[PDB]
Design a protein around this ligand. Structure first.
Ligand SMILES: C[C@H](CCC(=O)NCCC[N+](C)(C)CCCS(=O)(=O)[O-])[C@H]1CC[C@H]2[C@@H]3[C@H](O)C[C@@H]4C[C@H](O)CC[C@]4(C)[C@H]3C[C@H](O)[C@]12C
Ligand SMILES: C[C@H](CCC(=O)NCCC[N+](C)(C)CCCS(=O)(=O)[O-])[C@H]1CC[C@H]2[C@@H]3[C@H](O)C[C@@H]4C[C@H](O)CC[C@]4(C)[C@H]3C[C@H](O)[C@]12C
Ligand SMILES: C[C@H](CCC(=O)NCCC[N+](C)(C)CCCS(=O)(=O)[O-])[C@H]1CC[C@H]2[C@@H]3[C@H](O)C[C@@H]4C[C@H](O)CC[C@]4(C)[C@H]3C[C@H](O)[C@]12C
Ligand SMILES: C[C@H](CCC(=O)NCCC[N+](C)(C)CCCS(=O)(=O)[O-])[C@H]1CC[C@H]2[C@@H]3[C@H](O)C[C@@H]4C[C@H](O)CC[C@]4(C)[C@H]3C[C@H](O)[C@]12C
Ligand SMILES: C[C@H](CCC(=O)NCCC[N+](C)(C)CCCS(=O)(=O)[O-])[C@H]1CC[C@H]2[C@@H]3[C@H](O)C[C@@H]4C[C@H](O)CC[C@]4(C)[C@H]3C[C@H](O)[C@]12C
Ligand SMILES: Nc1ncnc2c1ncn2[C@@H]1O[C@H](C[Se]C[C@H](N)C(=O)O)[C@@H](O)[C@H]1O
Ligand code: MET
Ligand code: SF4
Ligand SMILES: [Cl-]
Ligand SMILES: [Cl-]
Length: 346
C-alpha cells in the first residue's frame, strides 16, 4: 500500500520494487506524502538556502543531431549565433554584479570555442571570485582536463536516459557508454559533476525511470537535473506527447530521498509545462534555481524546446525575479558558492 512504500522510503530500503511501486501509484494522498517527505529531507540535509546559478547560453551552434532538441544540426529553421569571448566575460561580470555566486556557461556542441577559447573565458570569470560550471556536451578527456586547469569547478552532463538502446536511438551521434565515460572522466578530474534525465521521452517506460534513479544513486552525483520532455516542432519528435509534470515531480522527489545531500535544480522546463512549476519543484525536493542570463538578441534563439519562459522581459529581470521567488517561498538566497556539502552516513 502507499503507507508501506513510504515507510520503506523512510527507512532507506531502496529496492527496485519500492521505486517502481512509488512511480506506479497514482493516489493523491500517496503523492502528497511523498512530496512532503522529499521536502522535509531537503530541509534537514540542505536547509532553506536556494542557490542561484546564472546561465549564459553563449552559442546555439551544434554538431550533434539529438532527436528531441531544437538545436539539432538538421534544424535549418533556426538563426544560429555565437557570443564573442568579451561579450561572455562581460555578461558574466554583470551577473556577479547582480549577486550570482555561480556562472553556468552552456552551449550546443559548437567546435569553434573548443578547447582554448573556453579556457580563456573560464580564467577571466574565475578572477571574479565565483564558481564556474560548464555545460558544453561530450568532448575529449584532454579538453576536460584543460578546462579544469583553467579553473572550472563543475560540469553538467545529463545522462538523458540510462536505457542504452533508447539512448542510441535518440542520440544517434553517440551512446550511453560514451556519455557515462564522459561523466566518469569528469568525476576523476575533480569536477563537481551533474547528471540527470528527461521524463516522458517517446518509448521510455516506468522501468526505465527506475533505472534512471538507480543510476543516479549508484554514481552519487553532486547535481541532478531532471525535467519533462517537451516536443519541439522543428524536430523528428514534434508530434510526440509531452512528459507528465506530476510524474517528473515524483522523479525529483525520489532523487532527493535517494541523494539527500545533493544539489537539485527546479528546472526551467518544469516552469514551462506548468505555470509556477519551478516553485512547486522547490517545495518537493529541489534547492537550486538557474535564472536565464543570456542577453537579447540571442536569448530568444536558444530554444531547446518551445515556450521557454523568461523571453519577453528585460534580460536583467531573471535574477531579481528569482530573489523575489525565494523570499515568497519562505526560503533564503545562498550565502556561498553552494557547493555540495556531503553528510556521510550509513
Ligand atoms: C481549499 C480551496 C477552496 C475550496 C472551497 O471552499 N471552495 C481550494 C480552491 C482551489 C483548490 C486548488 C485547485 O483546485 C488546484 C489544485 C487541485 C488539486 O487537485 C489539489 C490542489 C489544488 C492546489 C487545490 C487545493 C484546494 O482544494 C483549493 C485551494
Ligand atoms: C496551498 C494548497 C491548498 C491548501 C489549502 O488551501 N487548504 C485549505 C485551507 C487550510 N488553511 C490552513 C489555510 C486553513 C484551514 C481552515 S479552513 O477554514 O480554511 O478550512 C496545498 C494543498 C496541497 C499542498 C501540497 C501538498 O501537501 C504536497 C506538497 C507538500 C510539500 O511539503 C510542499 C509542497 C506541496 C506541493 C504542497 C503545497 C501546498 O501546501 C498545497 C498545494
Ligand atoms: C550592479 C548595480 C550597480 C552597483 C554594483 O556594481 N554593485 C556590485 C555589487 C556586487 N555584490 C552583489 C557582490 C554586492 C553584494 C553586497 S551584499 O551586501 O548583498 O553582500 C547594483 C545597484 C543596485 C543593485 C540592486 C539592488 O541592491 C537591489 C537588489 C539586491 C539583491 O541583493 C541583488 C539584486 C538587486 C536587484 C541589486 C542588483 C545589483 O547589485 C544592482 C543593480
Ligand atoms: C492546476 C494545474 C493545471 C493547470 C492547467 O490548466 N494547465 C495542475 C498541473 C500540475 C498540478 C500539481 C501537480 O499534480 C503536483 C501536486 C499534486 C498535489 O496532489 C496537489 C498539488 C500539486 C502541486 C498539483 C496542483 C495543480 O493540480 C497542478 C499545478
Ligand atoms: C529589487 C527587487 C524588486 C526585490 C524583490 C525581492 C527582493 C529580495 C528579497 O526581499 C529577499 C532578500 C531580503 C533581504 O533583506 C535583502 C536581499 C533580498 C535578496 C531582496 C533584494 C531585493 O530587495 C529584491 C530582489
Ligand atoms: N525537447 C526538450 N525537452 C526538454 N528538455 C530538453 C529538450 N531538449 C533538450 N533538453 C534537455 O535540456 C538539457 C540541458 Se539543461 C535544461 C534546462 N535546465 C531547462 O530546463 O531549460 C539537455 O541535457 C536535455 O536533457
Ligand atoms: C543545450 S543541451 C545541454 C548542453 C550540451 N549540448 C548537452 O547536450 O549536454
Ligand atoms: S541536446 Fe545538447 S548535443 Fe544534443 S542537439 Fe541539443 S545542444 Fe546539441
Ligand atoms: Cl552549478
Ligand atoms: Cl539542469
Amino acid at each position: 500500500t502507499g503507507r508501506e512504500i513510504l515507510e520503506k522510503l523512510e527507512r532507506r530500503e531502496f529496492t527496485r520494487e519500492v521505486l517502481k511501486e512509488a512511480l506506479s501509484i497514482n493516489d493523491r494522498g500517496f503523492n502528497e506524502a511523498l512530496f512532503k517527505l522529499a521536502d522535509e529531507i531537503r530541509r534537514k540535509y540542505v536547509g532553506d538556502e536556494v542557490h542561484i546559478r546564472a546561465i549564459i547560453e553563449f552559442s546555439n551552434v551544434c554538431r550533434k543531431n539529438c532527436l528531441y532538441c531544437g538545436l539539432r544540426r538538421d534544424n535549418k529553421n533556426l538563426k544560429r549565433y555565437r557570443m564573442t569571448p568579451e561579450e561572455i566575460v562581460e555578461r558574466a561580470r554583470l551577473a556577479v554584479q547582480f549577486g550570482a555566486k555561480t556562472i553556468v556557461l552552456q552551449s550546443g556542441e559548437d567546435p569553434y570555442x573548443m578547447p582554448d577559447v573556453i579556457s580563456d573565458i573560464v580564467k577571466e570569470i574565475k578572477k571574479m571570485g565565483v564558481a564556474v560550471t560548464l555545460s558544453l556536451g561530450e568532448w575529449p578527456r584532454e579538453y576536460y582536463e584543460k578546462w579544469k586547469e583553467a579553473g572550472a569547478d563543475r560540469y553538467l552532463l545529463r545522462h538523458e536516459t540510462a536505457n542504452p538502446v533508447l539512448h542510441r536511438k535518440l542520440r544517434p551521434d553517440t551512446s550511453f557508454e560514451n556519455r557515462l565515460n564522459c561523466l566518469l572522466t569528469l568525476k576523476e578530474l575533480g569536477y563537481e559533476t551533474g547528471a540527470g534525465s528527461m521524463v516522458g521521452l517517446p518509448g521510455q517506460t516506468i522501468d526505465d525511470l527506475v533505472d534512471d534513479l538507480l543510476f543516479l544513486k549508484e554514481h552519487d552525483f553532486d547535481m541532478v537535473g531532471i525535467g519533462p520532455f517537451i516536443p519541439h516542432p522543428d524536430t523528428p519528435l514534434a508530434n510526440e506527447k509531452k512528459g507528465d509534470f506530476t510524474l517528473t515531480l515524483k522523479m525529483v522527489a525520489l532523487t532527493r530521498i535517494l541523494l539527500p545531500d545533493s544539489n537539485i535544480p527546479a528546472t526551467t522546463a518544469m516552469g514551462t509545462i506548468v505555470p509556477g512549476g519551478r516553485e512547486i519543484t522547490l517545495r518537493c525536493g529541489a534547492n537550486v534555481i538557474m535564472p536565464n542570463w543570456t542577453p537579447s538578441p540571442y536569448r530568444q534563439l536558444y530554444q531547446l524546446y518551445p515556450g521557454k519562459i523568461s523571453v519577453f522581459e528585460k534580460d536583467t529581470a531573471s535574477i531579481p525575479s528569482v530573489m523575489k521567488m525565494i523570499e515568497l517561498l519562505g526560503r533564503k538566497p545562498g550565502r556561498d558558492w553552494g557547493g555540495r556539502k556531503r553528510v556521510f552516513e550509513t
